[PDB]
Structure formats: structure tokens, C-alpha cells
């Protein structure tokens, strides 16, 4: 099933640049697929994998990557699909969400990592565009977020608006092994500004 982050993505071009605008064909902003982590039997609830998009992992988008390198700003959504792998003997659930200006991160900003939320948060995480991954029901959370932020577009090198939380609700109960989480980000409606110079 497909769940939308506040609204379908707009291919509108930035209300704040008289500067020339390169739109990114899918074939440039292609698709990317990596493993988040291995949800283990010990990690008590309140845990989570922070995936602030896209940075840290931006070095690895090797094409989309490339154009955002030599360009000052970008506006883009995200088709993102988190995929836990587990059998029918495992129990537990997570809740993975897209969060607007998420922050806590102990300033390990724009670096994916792992944390334990304060609780009032995991309790109310669901107050954001999120989906449930319930080990006796499904094995996939699917979301699509639109460009968002104070500016009508930003610098992905300084700001990451979207950030996926992958929260542990009910601990992993079942067979001794771990359950590998995974995620496919692929940029939607990409658009660049100001080419920067040559790396010399």
C-alpha cells in the first residue's frame, strides 16, 4: 500500500531563483537500495534507525549523487520503501516514519545512526506520516514525501528536510536470528540550481 507524506510531490520550479534550472529526469535521479540494519533480539523498544535523507549516504547515490555535487541547491521528494526480512515465527513490529526537520541526533547531523527516543515520542511518533510494520501481517512500509521546508528549496549539504525514523515498537520475539531492515530511496521530482566550479 502507498502512503503520502502530507501531499503528492509538485514538480513546480522554485519560487526563489531567477537563476537557470536543470530538472532531473528519473534516469539521472535513479533508484537506490541499501540495508539499514539488523533489528536484533536485545534492542528493547524505543530504539530506532535514523535515516536523515539523504546525506551520509549521499556519496553512494552515484549519479543523482553526481549532479547534486556540482550544484548549489535541490528540491525533491522521495519514494522510500523500508523492507524488514523475517519469517512467520518472528513477532514484533516497528513503525517507520518520515519526519519534517527531525532533530535530536546529538548533532551527528545528516549521518544516519541509532538512538533511543524519549518515549512521549515513540508513543506519539504516529502523529507523523508513518506506516506499521507488524511481523504477523506485512513485511513492507512504503512512503512518498514531497519537497518541504522553510525555503522553497534548500541546500542538501546543510539541511535535510526529510528523515526516516525506523522505530522499534514490540521487540523482536522469536527465532534466535536477527531481522535485517532495508531501504530503497529514489528521488522524485529533482531540480537543481547554480553549478559550482571545477574541483581544482
Amino acid at each position: 500500500g502507498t502512503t503520502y507524506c502530507y501531499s503528492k510531490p509538485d514538480g513546480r520550479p522554485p519560487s526563489t531563483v531567477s537563476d537557470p534550472v536543470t530538472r532531473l529526469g528519473p534516469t539521472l535521479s535513479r533508484h537506490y537500495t541499501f540495508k539499514v540494519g539488523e533489528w536484533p533480539h536485545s534492542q528493547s523498544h524505543g530504539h530506532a534507525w535514523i535515516c536523515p535523507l539523504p546525506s551520509d549516504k549521499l556519496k553512494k547515490m552515484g549519479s543523482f549523487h553526481e549532479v547534486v555535487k556540482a550544484h548549489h541547491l535541490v528540491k525533491n521528494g522521495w519514494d522510500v520503501v523500508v523492507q524488514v526480512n523475517a519469517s512467520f515465527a518472528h513477532s514484533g513490529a516497528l513503525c517507520v516514519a518520515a519526519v519534517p526537520e527531525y532533530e535530536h541526533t546529538h548533532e551527528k547531523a545528516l549521518k544516519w545512526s541509532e538512538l533511543e527516543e524519549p518515549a512521549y515520542t515513540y508513543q506519539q511518533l504516529s502523529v507523523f506520516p508513518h506506516q506499521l510494520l507488524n511481523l504477523r501481517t506485512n513485511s513492507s512500509v512504503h512512503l512518498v514525501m514531497p519537497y518541504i521546508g522553510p525555503g522553497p528549496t534548500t541546500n542538501l549539504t546543510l539541511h535535510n528536510p526529510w528523515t526516516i525514523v525506523i522505530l522499534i515498537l514490540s521487540e523482536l520475539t522469536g527465532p534466535g536470528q536477527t531481522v535485517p531492515v532495508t531501504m530503497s530511496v529514489a528521488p522524485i521530482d529533482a531540480m537543481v540550481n547554480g553549478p559550482l566550479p571545477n574541483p581544482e
Binding site: 502530507y6 501531499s7 509538485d10 513546480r12 519560487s15 523498544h45 512467520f88 515465527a89 518472528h90 513477532s91 514484533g92 513490529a93 518515549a119 512521549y120 515513540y122 508513543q123 506519539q124 511518533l125 504516529s126 502523529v127 506499521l132 507488524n134 511481523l135 504477523r136 501481517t137 514531497p146 518541504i148 521546508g149 522553510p150 522553497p152 515498537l169 514490540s170 521487540e171 520475539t173 522469536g174 527465532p175
Partner: protein
């Protein structure tokens, strides 16, 4: 020609909630437009169209084991200032007010592995007596049956029952508009599993959405933390 005026007794008093506004000193400011998604209008909307996760001994779920019977599994004084609400959205939103009103929807999501199955009697017990202590005691009241393995999740509506046109967002030593009853989940059967050495227990998340007839009133300021 000067108008004839009498200076109403309060004249130079302040009052922090005047239905009227102050004098402008920086006119002609046109502001930049905002597309920015998800502008909410009223707080009851997110509270209705949004599930919060309950609070029991610190976790947002309750357990079923391969051993339970009539010992009530989940119990809560129906009051906003109840325990199992403490963590949630709805509850915390209401702190911003004096009176609440309406039904609340509970979402239990059984999350034990598919090799697993179990059943519960979720029941609502009206605020009179001295609280039931066994399934066979609650059964005579409003309840339904949940066979996890028909739906792995279920919704249950805690109704609004009171001479009280409105209820108390700030409960206390038991009054007539202080409580509306008790929510209780009981274990109808126990945990049957393909292999009890792997799956011995199950975790049912329990979430709370705001009721369609739910409403809040009389905004209030915060007292001493406690």
C-alpha cells in the same frame, strides 16, 4: 462639539484576553506566500485522525502468555488523567483544557508471530461498584470478542456515558464527572503456538484515537508540575 464621555470604572485596567487588538506601528508589510504542506486548522482533527500509543508499565503493549485465565490483562480508570494515557497525544492535548467529551477508539494490534493465536474479551465496565476482577465477572457488561487470527488488529469504542454534558480533563478524588468507567482487556484463551519453546508470549500494541463526537473546551493555564 467635544463628545460627552464617562470613563467606565475599570478604564486603565489590562485584561489578557481582550477580544480586540492593539494599535499597528508597522503597516504595509506584504508577506511572502507559503505552499508548505499540512497546515492544520484545529487541534481536534489530528487528535481524531491520529492514533497515539498507550502506556502500561513503561511500554506501549500488553502481554499474553501461555498461562493466563481470568486475571484482567489491561485495566484503566476512564479519565483523561489516567495512567495508560499519560504517554499519548489525546491525553496531553487535553491538558490544554478543562472539559472533554465523547467516545475514544482503541486499537489493539496483536503482534505475536503468525505461528501464534489467542483471544480476548475487551470489555468496558461502568463506574459504579468496586471494579471486577475476573472475566466471568466482566462478561455481563459491554464487551466483544477478539480472536486474533480473524483480524490481527481490532478497534473498540469507549463510549460517553454521563449525566455530565461534559467531563473532567483534570480528574481527582472520585467525583460524578471525574470518571466515566473502566476499560479492561481480559484473556479469553491463552497463547497456542506451533512451538512453545520459540513463541511463549504475545505483544498487543494498544493505541488511542479521539472519538468522532470527542471535543474539548475552556483553555487553561498550567499549574505546578506533579
Amino acid at each position: 462639539a467635544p463628545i460627552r464621555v464617562v470613563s467606565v470604572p475599570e478604564s486603565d485596567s489590562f485584561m489578557s484576553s481582550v477580544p480586540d487588538n492593539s494599535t499597528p506601528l508597522y503597516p504595509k508589510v506584504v508577506v511572502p506566500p507559503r505552499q508548505v504542506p499540512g497546515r492544520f486548522t484545529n487541534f481536534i482533527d489530528v487528535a481524531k485522525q491520529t492514533y497515539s500509543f498507550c502506556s502500561i508499565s513503561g511500554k506501549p503493549y500488553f502481554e499474553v502468555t501461555n498461562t493466563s485465565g481470568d486475571e484482567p490483562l489491561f485495566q484503566m480508570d476512564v479519565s483523561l488523567s489516567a495512567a495508560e494515557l499519560h504517554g499519548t497525544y489525546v491525553a496531553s492535548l487535553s491538558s490544554f483544557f478543562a472539559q472533554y467529551r465523547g467516545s475514544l477508539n482503541f486499537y489493539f494490534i496483536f503482534t505475536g508471530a503468525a505461528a501464534t493465536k489467542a483471544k480476548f474479551l475487551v470489555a468496558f465496565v461502568p463506574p459504579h461498584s468496586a471494579a471486577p476482577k475476573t472475566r466471568d465477572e466482566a462478561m455481563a457488561c459491554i464487551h466483544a470478542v477478539w480472536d486474533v487470527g480473524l483480524n490481527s488488529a481490532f478497534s473498540f469504542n469507549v463510549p460517553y456515558s454521563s449525566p455530565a454534558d461534559f467531563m473532567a480533563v483534570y480528574s481527582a478524588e472520585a467525583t460524578v464527572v471525574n470518571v466515566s468507567g473502566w476499560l479492561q482487556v481480559y484473556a479469553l484463551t491463552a497463547l497456542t503456538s506451533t512451538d512453545i519453546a520459540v513463541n511463549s508470549k504475545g505483544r498487543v500494541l494498544v493505541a488511542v484515537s479521539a472519538g468522532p463526537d470527542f471535543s474539548l473546551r475552556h483553555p487553561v493555564d498550567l499549574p505546578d508540575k506533579q
